Amino acid sequence: KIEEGKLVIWINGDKGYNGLAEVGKKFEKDTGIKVTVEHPDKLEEKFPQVAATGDGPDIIFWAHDRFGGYAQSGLLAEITPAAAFQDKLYPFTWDAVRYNGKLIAYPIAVEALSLIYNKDLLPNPPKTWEEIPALDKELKAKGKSALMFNLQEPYFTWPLIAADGGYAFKYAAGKYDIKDVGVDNAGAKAGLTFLVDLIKNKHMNADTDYSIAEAAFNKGETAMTINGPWAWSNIDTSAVNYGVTVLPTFKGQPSKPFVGVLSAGINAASPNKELAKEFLENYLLTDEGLEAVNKDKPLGAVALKSYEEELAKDPRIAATMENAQKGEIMPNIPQMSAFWYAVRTAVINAASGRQTVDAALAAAQTNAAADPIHYDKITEEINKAVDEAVAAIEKSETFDPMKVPDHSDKFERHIGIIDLKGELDMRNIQVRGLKQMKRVGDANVKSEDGVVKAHLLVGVHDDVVSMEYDLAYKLGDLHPNTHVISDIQDFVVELSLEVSEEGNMTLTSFEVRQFANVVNHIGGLSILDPIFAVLSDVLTAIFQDTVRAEMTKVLAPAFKKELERNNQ
Ligand SMILES: OC[C@H]1O[C@H](O[C@H]2[C@H](O)[C@@H](O)[C@@H](O)O[C@@H]2CO)[C@H](O)[C@@H](O)[C@@H]1O
Ligand code: NA
């Protein structure tokens, strides 16, 4: 229950919430009304969840791109600033928060990504993304790195993906055609493929996230990084001598980062809409107000004419403005969340190798047009389901060691002056190592007609699934009996789940992907023994058919009974 007479405010953890708190103290020193600032995790989703239950904070902070959907849901109260107040803020920043002709929030400051380099390590930073692989070679020779930026959020990679032609929604005659997406076009594949080549060529790691990139850069390890104004504070207090400049160009074209406007919205179910207006219009959106917040963490180009004008003489801000001009201001429509999840998923999978650049973006083209949902929420949820299910399997002993029915097969190959005939049969077949199969990566979710579909991967990586067994084959007059051990590398399972509106999780599909490779160790026989090649080829073949199948038929049931136990 939103407490009346008090002000609860939410802002992102990477912003100057400590400074925002001080402004909250002054408000309390003048009105007696306490202001509490909190920076929850996943607030861009937490808010719409609690605010939908008629609860939440009185004021929520975030880039305008999210607010479109918030307002659509009726979670945001229409702001009421006098024409005189609007006048003291740049018009374009009001357009940013205008949804359906109504102003649904107060703009705070414009923010754009810029290139951040180490003056000492790199006095003159590269002007293009292409001359970066070369620069990495040099730095590596000195135990350094060329570039490190968050690859877990599509917000940071998008600048490159759009550079050559990528785009979210086609804007036409004052309207964003939610059907005309542009993430898998020629211009987009070029960018993502480039980004992927950087990882394939080990110039950067896919696992790299915000904190890892920040630590390396501020530690002096990497020469460059890509971040926003908020990031400057931590670099200031580091030892790194830094500069902020124009992002690298791609194919003679500038990187087009999505520009966002940090906005403050008032929760519709708030009983303190007047106290909220006071705070925002007369305590935060003042030169003294924005300064307190800015000292803690730079806001970028504030929407307040007076202050934006004062800090406009900052080289770093001058850079940010340059990047903003080259890129475009994000649309605020509700479909924006889908767009983000789609791209976020395409980038992550393409960078991890889970999907090829084409497969990823094609799926993003589709997903960006699906029914927006609390992705994170549902993802963590489904992962949790599979995990516990897989952990249950780990308990049973029926699958590890997994007994496998014998098998016999006849073959032949015209080897010389003989249509070489001969067969062999396997006994005491046992699969091992399936007790260590975890979930690889997040569940890739999508919602259609109210039903959620999820695709996952369960496998035994950084380990091996061996199948030991007694073998016997016929070679002319030789009837040898030995023991074999076939190792399978990269054992993977493709899962397909479906969560009904009733909340029922039913297994859609289950298949053991064909083994990337199989290394047969035939006892007493050497890889140099001419026969090995034939036997190995046969064993591996019946492995990719018989074994792999009678392995799926045994794991499919166990995965159904679990993913559908508590089901109902
Ligand atoms: O990565 C997708 C994400 O991008 C934007 O979020 C930014 C935000 O604008 C910045 O102020 C800062 O907090 O970094 C965020 C990236 O993690 C969009 O505003 C957001 O909706 C979107 O999910
Ligand atoms: Na802080």
Side-chain angles (χ1 to χ4, degrees), residues 2-28 30-174 176-312 314-395 398-402 404-409 411 413 416 420 422 425-426 428-431 433-434 436-452 454-460 462-473 476 480-482 484-510 512-544 546-549 551-559 562-564 567-568:
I2 299 176
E3 182 184 304
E4 171 167 51
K6 169 188 180 179
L7 278 180
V8 176
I9 182 179
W10 288 0
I11 188 175
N12 193 51
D14 62 22
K15 306 301 171 58
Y17 61 75
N18 278 314
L20 183 56
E22 286 303 294
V23 174
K25 289 192 63 178
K26 178 181 182 56
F27 185 69
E28 178 177 54
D30 300 332
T31 311
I33 296 178
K34 176 57 183 182
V35 177
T36 298
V37 184
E38 313 191 305
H39 47 90
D41 298 293
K42 323 165 179 181
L43 80 76
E44 69 292 301
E45 286 206 322
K46 183 169 297 179
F47 173 77
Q49 294 184 58
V50 308
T53 67
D55 217 292
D58 304 83
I59 309 179
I60 176 186
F61 274 68
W62 198 271
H64 71 290
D65 67 298
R66 288 280 166 179
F67 287 42
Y70 293 178
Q72 189 85 81
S73 296
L75 305 175
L76 291 180
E78 159 159 50
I79 61 174
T80 60
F85 189 83
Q86 293 182 50
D87 183 289
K88 52 176 58 183
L89 263 73
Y90 292 118
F92 87 87
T93 72
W94 285 114
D95 297 282
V97 298
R98 200 177 305 96
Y99 186 60
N100 279 167
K102 293 183 183 179
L103 294 179
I104 50 67
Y106 291 78
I108 307 300
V110 187
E111 58 196 10
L113 289 172
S114 293
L115 177 72
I116 300 176
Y117 62 110
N118 193 312
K119 312 282 277 191
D120 297 314
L121 272 57
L122 190 66
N124 307 71
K127 301 302 177 64
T128 69
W129 276 93
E130 297 88 316
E131 76 201 70
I132 293 185
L135 180 55
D136 184 61
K137 298 179 186 179
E138 278 191 55
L139 296 169
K140 247 63 181 299
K142 291 167 293 181
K144 292 305 178 186
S145 183
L147 188 57
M148 281 188 92
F149 64 105
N150 178 37
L151 294 181
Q152 305 310 297
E153 288 294 317
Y155 174 66
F156 300 77
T157 55
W158 174 262
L160 174 66
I161 301 182
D164 187 51
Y167 69 72
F169 301 107
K170 190 74 171 186
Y171 188 61
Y176 284 108
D177 189 308
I178 59 177
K179 294 298 175 180
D180 184 8
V181 184
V183 295
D184 76 328
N185 63 54
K189 295 193 184 69
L192 183 49
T193 296
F194 192 81
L195 178 63
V196 177
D197 287 323
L198 288 175
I199 308 178
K200 288 182 172 180
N201 302 323
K202 296 165 291 182
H203 295 307
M204 54 176 65
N205 192 318
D207 292 310
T208 299
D209 58 40
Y210 191 95
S211 68
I212 292 175
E214 175 168 53
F217 185 77
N218 299 28
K219 187 192 302 181
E221 297 190 301
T222 183
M224 299 185 289
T225 182
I226 299 178
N227 217 312
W230 56 83
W232 308 341
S233 289
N234 289 327
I235 311 177
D236 277 356
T237 51
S238 70
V240 179
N241 219 262
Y242 73 107
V244 186
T245 187
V246 188
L247 291 167
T249 65
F250 182 53
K251 298 180 61 179
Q253 287 166 143
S255 290
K256 305 177 67 64
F258 253 137
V259 189
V261 183
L262 180 59
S263 297
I266 301 169
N267 187 333
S270 175
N272 306 296
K273 297 188 184 65
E274 270 297 348
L275 295 179
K277 180 178 181 179
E278 174 83 310
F279 179 71
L280 301 184
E281 305 195 325
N282 305 310
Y283 284 75
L284 178 60
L285 293 174
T286 64
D287 290 311
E288 326 83 71
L290 300 180
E291 181 177 304
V293 176
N294 191 74
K295 283 198 178 188
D296 178 13
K297 285 285 180 287
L299 295 162
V302 301
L304 187 61
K305 291 180 181 178
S306 62
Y307 207 55
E308 179 289 316
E309 175 183 297
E310 190 195 306
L311 296 182
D314 194 304
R316 304 177 297 173
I317 291 183
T320 305
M321 293 291 85
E322 204 193 319
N323 285 302
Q325 304 175 306
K326 299 186 171 178
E328 58 195 60
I329 300 176
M330 303 182 257
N332 65 57
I333 58 181
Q335 202 63 48
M336 279 299 278
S337 58
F339 166 71
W340 285 134
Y341 179 75
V343 175
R344 178 173 194 291
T345 298
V347 175
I348 288 186
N349 294 336
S352 63
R354 176 170 178 167
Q355 296 178 305
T356 57
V357 162
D358 282 65
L361 296 183
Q365 186 71 5
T366 292
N367 282 45
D371 305 316
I373 64 177
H374 299 308
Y375 299 110
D376 175 75
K377 166 69 182 62
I378 299 176
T379 300
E380 298 284 63
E381 182 185 301
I382 295 179
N383 295 348
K384 194 177 191 61
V386 180
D387 285 43
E388 308 184 314
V390 175
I393 304 295
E394 185 286 301
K395 294 298 182 179
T398 55
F399 307 133
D400 184 53
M402 178 189 282
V404 180
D406 304 316
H407 173 272
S408 58
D409 195 300
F411 56 78
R413 287 181 179 175
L420 172 55
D425 46 61
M426 301 152 71
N428 294 52
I429 306 178
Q430 297 200 304
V431 183
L434 287 188
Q436 286 202 55
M437 51 176 204
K438 284 188 176 180
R439 167 179 56 75
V440 184
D442 288 309
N444 291 190
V445 178
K446 173 182 173 183
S447 182
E448 286 288 313
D449 312 300
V451 61
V452 179
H455 291 61
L456 296 82
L457 301 175
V458 183
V460 180
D462 198 295
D463 285 293
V464 179
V465 170
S466 292
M467 193 181 104
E468 315 174 309
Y469 56 94
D470 293 16
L471 175 64
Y473 52 98
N481 268 45
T482 187
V484 184
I485 288 187
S486 303
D487 302 315
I488 297 178
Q489 279 210 303
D490 298 309
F491 173 74
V492 182
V493 172
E494 311 227 8
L495 273 183
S496 289
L497 295 174
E498 185 165 300
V499 184
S500 62
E501 296 187 298
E502 300 62 50
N504 293 312
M505 177 184 282
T506 70
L507 191 67
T508 307
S509 175
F510 189 97
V512 175
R513 199 161 65 192
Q514 71 165 55
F515 317 120
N517 216 309
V518 176
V519 168
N520 304 300
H521 301 300
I522 307 177
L525 205 58
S526 172
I527 171 186
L528 293 185
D529 276 299
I531 188 59
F532 183 76
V534 184
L535 286 182
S536 182
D537 268 297
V538 182
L539 295 179
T540 307
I542 74 181
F543 228 67
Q544 297 276 47
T546 300
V547 181
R548 187 167 68 87
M551 193 158 71
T552 289
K553 177 175 293 182
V554 177
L555 294 168
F559 274 78
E562 291 301 300
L563 298 172
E564 298 169 55
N567 178 67
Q568 183 178 56

